[PDB]
Amino acid sequence: MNAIGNFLVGTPVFTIFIALALGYLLGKLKIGSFTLGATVGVLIVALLIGQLGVFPRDTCLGDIFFDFFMFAIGYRVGPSFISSMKKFGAKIVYATLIFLVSAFIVAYAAFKMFHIGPGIAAGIIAGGLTQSAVIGSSLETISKLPISDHLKTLYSNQIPIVYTLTYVFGTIGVLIFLRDIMPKLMHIDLKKQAVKTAKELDMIPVPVIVASTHFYTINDGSSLIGQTLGTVNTKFAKGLVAAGLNDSADMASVINAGDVLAISGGIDEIGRAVQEFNLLEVTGKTKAYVSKQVVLKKNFSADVLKNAQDKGVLVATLAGDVMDPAQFSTLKPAESVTLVGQKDAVSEVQSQLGRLRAAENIINYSWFALGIALSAALGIVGTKVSGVPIALGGGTASLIVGLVQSIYRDKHAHMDTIPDSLLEFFQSIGLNLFIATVGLSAAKTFISAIQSMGISVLLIGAVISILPHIITFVIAYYLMKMEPISIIGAQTGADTLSAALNDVSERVGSDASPFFAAAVAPAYAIGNIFLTLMGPIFIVLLS
Amino acid sequence: MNAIGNFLVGTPVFTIFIALALGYLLGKLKIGSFTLGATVGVLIVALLIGQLGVFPRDTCLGDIFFDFFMFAIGYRVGPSFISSMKKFGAKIVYATLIFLVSAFIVAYAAFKMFHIGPGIAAGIIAGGLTQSAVIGSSLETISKLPISDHLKTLYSNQIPIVYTLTYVFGTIGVLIFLRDIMPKLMHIDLKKQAVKTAKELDMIPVPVIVASTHFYTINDGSSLIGQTLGTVNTKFAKGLVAAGLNDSADMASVINAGDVLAISGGIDEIGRAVQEFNLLEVTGKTKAYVSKQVVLKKNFSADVLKNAQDKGVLVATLAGDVMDPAQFSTLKPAESVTLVGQKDAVSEVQSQLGRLRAAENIINYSWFALGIALSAALGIVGTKVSGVPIALGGGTASLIVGLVQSIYRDKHAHMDTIPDSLLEFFQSIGLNLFIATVGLSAAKTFISAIQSMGISVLLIGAVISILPHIITFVIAYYLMKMEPISIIGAQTGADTLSAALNDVSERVGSDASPFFAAAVAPAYAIGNIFLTLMGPIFIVLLS
């Protein structure tokens, strides 16, 4: 099997993209009502592939794709972050500070009970709590510690092996617990509860009757013949604007036989007018009638918005449904109205109302590249506390950069934005590629550590990974009376388990995935910082 | 400036994603009617950034993104490749074999005239003809050559520097020549000529009147009252099918007052029926009426397709427009019909006609990963000819894999496909990232080679890069009577200038970009192979 092993180690792209192809197929497997999922299928396939030969750890593609994934989450959760935090931010910050202290207490108790060594303790924590930087901080701390050189070398060798052994369960077992067992224990369905919580806020509006233009043709003998376009437009009720005879929007032309009288507005109102006047619909071939999206200026005038109907343009909300005239005064700057009608009339009221909103299909390459560059530059930033180095790291820096960038783009919508399909693809493939890389990097060491310290360390790692979640769940749900989706998001952020984000978001759906990411984000930063600090203090205490 | 240089070299992601952000902004600059373009803006910004400090060449991200770009082109050009090759494939293969021999003749003549050394000759060819593997093949050949060790070392040192000096002009000047000067010299507009050539084939159909369902409400006193749904459906002309009273598709129910009579078909025909019966349109809230896309089976029955109208389902082409019944017999297997109507009736005729077609919005992660893995595995393949190693390489292997994968998916459409927006994003960012990486890798050597062999080598490289294009253009347009877009594509493929693909495709537009890529692809492979072989023979001849 030396040929297969040599080929797989020689070509890294082939291995990481053949573990990402069979991994998804394995993830699509459904047993009963339980689906393995893409992340678990990739972490299972990558280990078996990595048993074939030795694979060095690749920090060149995996880290960049993880940065892309974190930026995708931060950009997708941008607009709703403030609204989510105003409702549930202090509860989440009080649940992130309970999981961490509970994990500290449980780990200390188990380590004291089972006389666990310092290196094994730091490896177990780094694996079960799914924090990789713990191994580096522990290496630095054990280097500083005044111990014998042989003991320091022994601990520094023990740390990576225990981390690799425990990390396998700390990604599958914890994810299964907080994704399948947890909703059942809380007597709720993940999808249903997330959708209901998102409906409690203004996230998922009902589908609205879009207001469009129909090119009706006037037949001879109609009562509309002999009357001006302005007269007919005034005679029409709200939600029915005459956009102009033929291709002209002038208000003084008379309706002679053989002319097209384009009518814009809602479907039911247009149908009532059609039944009233016995008009005949014709699929008119004209490119002079359009719907534009206008971002209101800082001092948008109410008079022009009110008189756009008189000018011949239908004003509607961004969704597409026509809005009541009384809503005109309630409108505020930075809100995006939609003007539907003739080109000449829509290009003037837009000129007096604000500026055109950029469509979602166009991709802002400069925006995306600047976001990635700033994410890297911010992840560089760090500082040392009590001789222990900490930093924002790729995850936190990318999350913050995505948040601020999406908030700025939402505030000023005249610039283009990265499409949601692209963001979803990056969110999916970025985390899965990182999981594949780490699984391929650590499979032989895992099977070797099955033989030595095989059972005790694995079981203690499972206990330290599972028990804090249980106690924090009991405290939050039975005493702190949270909502289930917030509990799950706060725990996922506190544990710093990025693998759970993709799976829980895909089970929730795109409707409340922004809510889940918003719940995760504040927990993620505090969990990252405290878990990074968790290793060195444990080493100092135990040894 | 040592702090800035150290930070830029230390963080590679920051540098390559800050040269990709300012690069696009510089590319958006428009002077007169000439736009620099994304690729030239990135190659200009990256050189200035690379002058700050020394940057090692990164073959880890750039090569993978180039593979992604080539796969994106190969997948986008998949379905139309055979149709394009049947019309213009031999002309393209006869223009790829003229550019290469012309370049050989011109390079040999210039090298003999100016007593050009072997290493400088191989570097000039590798730079002007934009083929990087030439430097490696030349290094191997000069290693084999029985020359003095000092002379061999001198040539091996000279090759990279001359390549770096000449490569700057061989990417900007040639692109400008074949993108701006060439259309003007051919008295055609690139966009207009490409659109006309694509219209000559069946690529861009005119927008078609989509056939949909309107939920009309029967009012009291209507002539439709007292008649069965089947009777009304039979009384309706072609293109007007009664999809069922209320939410039931049964053919025997009578039309009582207060019922919704959903009518499916074309807008103008529905409007004529509305004028005939004075029906009132209502935005009915029902999810039981849908349009599905059915891929016909190998033995699709004509009887069921003919009687779908009687059953209550409108059959239409994949575009959306209703089709004539006489077209039913002309339909063939693997063609995708569209069935519009009630859920119960559409889920049965589909069951007897074939299988549902997968929507474009869904992304096939397994398909994409398998494509990338097979591209890498095929790029591994190679062989040696006359002691000179050649291989398919990333470009050719990825192009072939994308072609065959897209053709297979088009043949069997029941499986999902990678979205076109994602393919476009990869095609854009993949090449630009590679350009940024190579420009950052070679800027100090470029400015240094400005001082030594600054003018003569640069001018000879420009001549060898430009003149073969001119003579092959004259031969093709004035004697071989080609079309302009085919000439441009064949030359771009023969020169193996992947940087021109993105810019010419973006100027052409998405309408005929598949035609341009199809014209490029066969030229690309032969150009790659012959340019790879071009170096060693020149070294052997000159020295």
Coordinates of N, CA and C in Angstrom, one line a residue, chain A residues 16-167:
Chain A
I16 N -7.1 16.1 0.4 CA -8.0 16.9 1.1 C -9.3 17.1 0.3
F17 N -9.3 16.9 -1.1 CA -10.5 17.0 -1.8 C -11.1 15.7 -2.2
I18 N -10.5 14.6 -1.8 CA -11.1 13.3 -1.9 C -11.7 12.9 -0.5
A19 N -11.2 13.5 0.5 CA -11.8 13.3 1.8 C -13.0 14.2 2.0
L20 N -13.1 15.3 1.2 CA -14.2 16.2 1.2 C -15.3 15.8 0.2
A21 N -15.1 14.8 -0.6 CA -16.1 14.2 -1.6 C -16.8 13.0 -1.0
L22 N -16.0 12.0 -0.5 CA -16.6 10.9 0.2 C -17.2 11.3 1.5
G23 N -16.6 12.3 2.1 CA -17.2 12.8 3.4 C -18.6 13.2 3.3
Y24 N -18.9 14.0 2.3 CA -20.3 14.5 2.2 C -21.2 13.3 1.8
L25 N -20.8 12.4 1.0 CA -21.6 11.2 0.7 C -21.9 10.4 2.0
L26 N -20.9 10.2 2.9 CA -21.1 9.6 4.1 C -22.0 10.4 5.0
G27 N -21.9 11.7 5.0 CA -22.8 12.5 5.8 C -24.2 12.5 5.4
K28 N -24.5 12.3 4.1 CA -25.9 12.2 3.6 C -26.6 11.0 4.1
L29 N -25.8 10.0 4.7 CA -26.4 8.8 5.2 C -27.4 9.1 6.3
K30 N -28.6 8.5 6.3 CA -29.6 8.8 7.3 C -30.0 7.4 7.9
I31 N -29.9 7.3 9.2 CA -30.2 6.2 10.0 C -31.4 6.6 10.9
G32 N -32.5 5.9 10.7 CA -33.7 6.4 11.5 C -34.0 7.8 11.1
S33 N -34.1 8.6 12.2 CA -34.3 10.1 12.0 C -33.0 10.9 12.3
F34 N -31.8 10.2 12.3 CA -30.6 10.8 12.6 C -29.7 10.8 11.4
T35 N -29.2 12.0 11.1 CA -28.3 12.2 10.0 C -26.9 12.5 10.5
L36 N -25.8 11.9 9.9 CA -24.5 12.1 10.4 C -24.0 13.5 10.2
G37 N -24.4 14.1 9.1 CA -24.0 15.5 8.8 C -22.6 15.6 8.1
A38 N -22.4 16.7 7.4 CA -21.2 16.9 6.6 C -20.0 16.9 7.4
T39 N -20.0 17.6 8.5 CA -18.8 17.7 9.4 C -18.4 16.4 10.0
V40 N -19.3 15.7 10.5 CA -19.0 14.4 11.1 C -18.6 13.4 10.0
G41 N -19.3 13.4 8.9 CA -18.8 12.5 7.8 C -17.4 12.8 7.3
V42 N -17.1 14.1 7.3 CA -15.7 14.4 6.9 C -14.7 14.0 7.9
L43 N -15.0 14.2 9.2 CA -14.1 13.9 10.3 C -14.0 12.4 10.4
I44 N -15.0 11.6 9.9 CA -14.9 10.1 10.0 C -14.1 9.6 8.8
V45 N -14.4 10.2 7.6 CA -13.7 9.7 6.4 C -12.2 10.1 6.4
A46 N -11.9 11.3 6.9 CA -10.5 11.8 6.9 C -9.6 10.9 7.8
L47 N -10.2 10.4 9.0 CA -9.4 9.6 9.8 C -9.0 8.3 9.1
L48 N -10.0 7.7 8.4 CA -9.7 6.4 7.7 C -8.7 6.7 6.6
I49 N -8.8 7.8 5.9 CA -7.8 8.1 4.8 C -6.5 8.3 5.4
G50 N -6.4 9.0 6.6 CA -5.1 9.3 7.2 C -4.5 8.1 7.8
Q51 N -5.2 7.0 8.1 CA -4.6 5.8 8.5 C -3.7 5.2 7.4
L52 N -3.9 5.5 6.2 CA -3.1 4.9 5.1 C -1.6 5.3 5.2
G53 N -1.3 6.6 5.4 CA 0.1 7.0 5.5 C 0.2 8.2 6.5
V54 N 1.4 8.7 6.6 CA 1.7 9.8 7.4 C 1.4 11.1 6.6
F55 N 0.7 12.0 7.2 CA 0.3 13.3 6.6 C 0.7 14.5 7.5
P56 N 1.6 15.4 7.0 CA 2.0 16.5 7.8 C 0.8 17.5 7.9
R57 N 0.8 18.3 8.9 CA -0.3 19.2 9.2 C -0.1 20.4 8.2
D58 N -1.2 20.8 7.5 CA -1.2 21.8 6.5 C -1.9 23.0 7.1
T59 N -1.2 24.1 7.5 CA -1.7 25.3 8.0 C -1.8 26.4 6.9
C60 N -1.6 26.1 5.7 CA -1.7 27.0 4.6 C -3.1 27.1 3.9
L61 N -3.7 26.0 3.7 CA -5.1 26.0 3.1 C -6.2 26.0 4.2
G62 N -6.0 25.2 5.2 CA -7.0 25.0 6.2 C -7.2 26.3 7.0
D63 N -6.2 27.0 7.4 CA -6.3 28.2 8.2 C -7.0 29.3 7.4
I64 N -6.6 29.4 6.1 CA -7.3 30.4 5.2 C -8.7 30.1 5.0
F65 N -9.1 28.8 4.8 CA -10.5 28.4 4.6 C -11.3 28.6 5.9
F66 N -10.6 28.4 7.1 CA -11.3 28.7 8.3 C -11.6 30.2 8.5
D67 N -10.6 31.0 8.1 CA -10.8 32.4 8.1 C -12.0 32.8 7.2
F68 N -12.1 32.2 6.0 CA -13.2 32.5 5.1 C -14.5 32.1 5.7
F69 N -14.5 30.9 6.4 CA -15.8 30.5 7.1 C -16.2 31.4 8.2
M70 N -15.3 31.8 9.0 CA -15.6 32.8 10.1 C -16.1 34.1 9.5
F71 N -15.4 34.6 8.5 CA -15.8 35.8 7.9 C -17.2 35.7 7.3
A72 N -17.5 34.5 6.7 CA -18.9 34.3 6.1 C -19.9 34.4 7.2
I73 N -19.7 33.7 8.3 CA -20.6 33.8 9.4 C -20.8 35.2 9.9
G74 N -19.7 35.9 10.1 CA -19.7 37.3 10.6 C -20.4 38.2 9.7
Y75 N -20.3 38.0 8.4 CA -21.0 38.9 7.4 C -22.5 38.5 7.3
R76 N -22.8 37.2 7.4 CA -24.2 36.9 7.4 C -25.0 37.3 8.6
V77 N -24.3 37.4 9.7 CA -25.0 37.7 11.0 C -24.9 39.2 11.3
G78 N -24.4 40.0 10.4 CA -24.1 41.4 10.6 C -25.4 42.2 11.0
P79 N -26.4 42.3 10.1 CA -27.5 43.3 10.3 C -28.3 43.0 11.5
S80 N -28.5 41.7 11.9 CA -29.4 41.4 13.0 C -28.7 41.3 14.3
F81 N -27.4 41.5 14.4 CA -26.6 41.3 15.6 C -27.1 42.3 16.7
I82 N -27.3 43.5 16.4 CA -27.6 44.5 17.4 C -29.0 44.2 17.9
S83 N -30.0 43.9 17.0 CA -31.3 43.6 17.4 C -31.4 42.4 18.3
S84 N -30.6 41.3 18.0 CA -30.5 40.1 18.8 C -29.9 40.4 20.1
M85 N -28.9 41.3 20.2 CA -28.2 41.5 21.4 C -29.0 42.4 22.4
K86 N -29.8 43.3 21.8 CA -30.7 44.1 22.7 C -31.7 43.3 23.4
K87 N -32.2 42.2 22.8 CA -33.1 41.3 23.4 C -32.4 40.3 24.4
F88 N -31.5 39.5 23.8 CA -30.8 38.5 24.6 C -29.3 38.7 24.4
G89 N -28.7 39.6 25.2 CA -27.2 39.7 25.2 C -26.6 39.4 26.6
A90 N -27.3 39.9 27.6 CA -26.9 39.7 29.0 C -27.1 38.3 29.5
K91 N -28.2 37.7 29.0 CA -28.4 36.3 29.3 C -27.3 35.4 28.7
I92 N -26.9 35.7 27.5 CA -25.9 34.9 26.8 C -24.6 35.1 27.5
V93 N -24.3 36.4 27.9 CA -23.0 36.6 28.6 C -23.0 36.1 30.0
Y94 N -24.2 35.8 30.6 CA -24.2 35.1 31.9 C -24.3 33.6 31.8
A95 N -24.5 33.1 30.6 CA -24.4 31.6 30.3 C -23.1 31.2 29.8
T96 N -22.3 32.2 29.2 CA -21.0 31.9 28.8 C -20.0 31.9 30.0
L97 N -20.4 32.7 31.1 CA -19.6 32.7 32.3 C -20.0 31.7 33.3
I98 N -21.0 30.8 33.0 CA -21.3 29.7 33.8 C -20.7 28.4 33.3
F99 N -20.8 28.2 32.0 CA -20.2 27.0 31.4 C -18.7 27.0 31.6
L100 N -18.0 28.1 31.5 CA -16.5 28.1 31.7 C -16.1 27.8 33.2
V101 N -16.8 28.4 34.1 CA -16.5 28.2 35.5 C -16.9 26.7 35.9
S102 N -18.0 26.2 35.3 CA -18.4 24.8 35.6 C -17.3 23.9 35.0
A103 N -16.8 24.2 33.8 CA -15.8 23.3 33.2 C -14.5 23.4 34.0
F104 N -14.1 24.6 34.5 CA -13.0 24.7 35.4 C -13.1 23.8 36.6
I105 N -14.3 23.9 37.3 CA -14.5 23.2 38.5 C -14.5 21.7 38.3
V106 N -15.2 21.2 37.2 CA -15.2 19.8 36.9 C -13.9 19.3 36.5
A107 N -13.1 20.0 35.7 CA -11.8 19.6 35.3 C -10.9 19.5 36.5
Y108 N -10.9 20.5 37.4 CA -10.1 20.5 38.6 C -10.4 19.3 39.5
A109 N -11.7 19.0 39.7 CA -12.1 17.9 40.6 C -11.7 16.6 40.0
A110 N -11.9 16.4 38.7 CA -11.5 15.1 38.1 C -10.0 14.9 38.1
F111 N -9.2 16.0 37.9 CA -7.8 15.9 37.8 C -7.2 15.7 39.2
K112 N -7.8 16.3 40.3 CA -7.4 16.0 41.6 C -7.8 14.6 42.0
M113 N -8.9 14.1 41.6 CA -9.4 12.8 42.0 C -8.5 11.7 41.4
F114 N -8.1 11.9 40.1 CA -7.4 10.8 39.4 C -5.9 11.2 39.2
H115 N -5.4 12.0 40.1 CA -4.0 12.4 40.1 C -3.4 12.6 38.7
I116 N -4.1 13.4 37.9 CA -3.8 13.6 36.5 C -2.6 14.5 36.4
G117 N -1.6 14.2 35.6 CA -0.4 14.9 35.4 C -0.6 16.3 34.7
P118 N 0.3 17.2 34.7 CA 0.1 18.5 34.1 C 0.0 18.5 32.6
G119 N 0.9 17.7 31.9 CA 0.7 17.7 30.5 C -0.5 17.0 30.0
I120 N -0.9 15.9 30.7 CA -2.1 15.1 30.4 C -3.3 16.0 30.7
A121 N -3.2 16.8 31.7 CA -4.3 17.7 32.1 C -4.5 18.8 31.0
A122 N -3.4 19.4 30.5 CA -3.5 20.4 29.5 C -4.0 19.8 28.2
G123 N -3.6 18.6 27.9 CA -4.0 18.0 26.6 C -5.5 17.6 26.7
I124 N -5.9 17.1 27.8 CA -7.3 16.7 28.0 C -8.2 18.0 27.8
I125 N -7.8 19.1 28.5 CA -8.6 20.3 28.3 C -8.6 20.8 26.9
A126 N -7.4 20.8 26.3 CA -7.3 21.3 24.9 C -8.1 20.5 23.9
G127 N -8.3 19.2 24.2 CA -9.1 18.3 23.3 C -10.5 18.4 23.6
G128 N -10.9 18.2 24.9 CA -12.4 18.2 25.2 C -13.0 19.5 25.0
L129 N -12.3 20.6 25.3 CA -12.9 21.9 25.1 C -12.6 22.5 23.8
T130 N -12.0 21.7 22.9 CA -11.8 22.0 21.5 C -11.1 23.4 21.3
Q131 N -10.0 23.6 22.0 CA -9.2 24.8 21.8 C -7.8 24.4 21.6
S132 N -7.3 24.7 20.4 CA -6.0 24.2 19.9 C -4.9 25.1 20.5
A133 N -5.1 26.4 20.7 CA -4.1 27.2 21.2 C -3.7 26.9 22.6
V134 N -4.5 26.1 23.3 CA -4.1 25.6 24.7 C -2.8 24.9 24.7
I135 N -2.6 24.1 23.6 CA -1.3 23.3 23.6 C -0.1 24.2 23.5
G136 N -0.2 25.3 22.7 CA 0.9 26.2 22.6 C 1.1 27.0 23.9
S137 N 0.0 27.5 24.5 CA 0.2 28.2 25.7 C 0.8 27.3 26.8
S138 N 0.3 26.0 26.9 CA 0.8 25.1 27.8 C 2.3 24.8 27.6
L139 N 2.7 24.7 26.3 CA 4.1 24.5 26.0 C 4.9 25.6 26.5
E140 N 4.5 26.9 26.3 CA 5.2 28.0 26.8 C 5.3 28.0 28.3
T141 N 4.1 27.7 29.0 CA 4.1 27.7 30.5 C 5.0 26.6 31.0
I142 N 5.0 25.4 30.5 CA 5.8 24.3 31.0 C 7.3 24.6 30.7
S143 N 7.6 25.4 29.6 CA 8.9 25.9 29.4 C 9.4 26.8 30.5
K144 N 8.5 27.7 30.9 CA 8.8 28.7 31.9 C 8.9 28.0 33.3
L145 N 8.1 26.9 33.5 CA 8.0 26.3 34.8 C 9.4 25.8 35.3
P146 N 9.8 26.0 36.6 CA 11.1 25.5 37.1 C 11.0 24.0 37.5
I147 N 11.0 23.1 36.4 CA 11.0 21.7 36.6 C 12.3 21.1 36.0
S148 N 12.5 19.8 36.2 CA 13.6 19.2 35.6 C 13.4 19.1 34.1
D149 N 14.6 19.1 33.3 CA 14.5 19.1 31.9 C 13.8 17.9 31.3
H150 N 14.1 16.7 31.9 CA 13.5 15.5 31.5 C 12.0 15.5 31.7
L151 N 11.6 16.0 32.8 CA 10.1 16.1 33.1 C 9.5 17.1 32.1
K152 N 10.1 18.2 31.8 CA 9.6 19.2 30.9 C 9.4 18.6 29.5
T153 N 10.5 17.9 29.1 CA 10.4 17.2 27.8 C 9.3 16.2 27.7
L154 N 9.1 15.4 28.8 CA 8.1 14.4 28.9 C 6.7 15.1 28.8
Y155 N 6.5 16.1 29.5 CA 5.2 16.8 29.5 C 4.9 17.4 28.1
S156 N 6.0 18.0 27.5 CA 5.8 18.6 26.2 C 5.5 17.6 25.1
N157 N 6.0 16.4 25.3 CA 5.7 15.3 24.4 C 4.3 14.7 24.7
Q158 N 3.9 14.7 25.9 CA 2.6 14.1 26.3 C 1.4 15.0 25.8
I159 N 1.6 16.3 25.8 CA 0.5 17.3 25.5 C -0.1 17.0 24.1
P160 N 0.7 16.9 23.0 CA 0.0 16.7 21.7 C -0.7 15.4 21.5
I161 N -0.2 14.3 22.1 CA -0.8 13.0 22.0 C -2.1 13.0 22.7
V162 N -2.2 13.5 23.9 CA -3.5 13.4 24.6 C -4.5 14.3 23.9
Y163 N -4.0 15.5 23.4 CA -4.9 16.4 22.6 C -5.5 15.6 21.4
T164 N -4.6 14.9 20.7 CA -5.1 14.2 19.5 C -6.1 13.1 19.9
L165 N -5.8 12.4 20.9 CA -6.7 11.3 21.4 C -8.0 11.8 21.8
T166 N -8.1 12.9 22.5 CA -9.3 13.4 23.1 C -10.1 14.2 22.1
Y167 N -9.4 14.9 21.1 CA -10.1 15.8 20.2 C -11.1 15.0 19.3

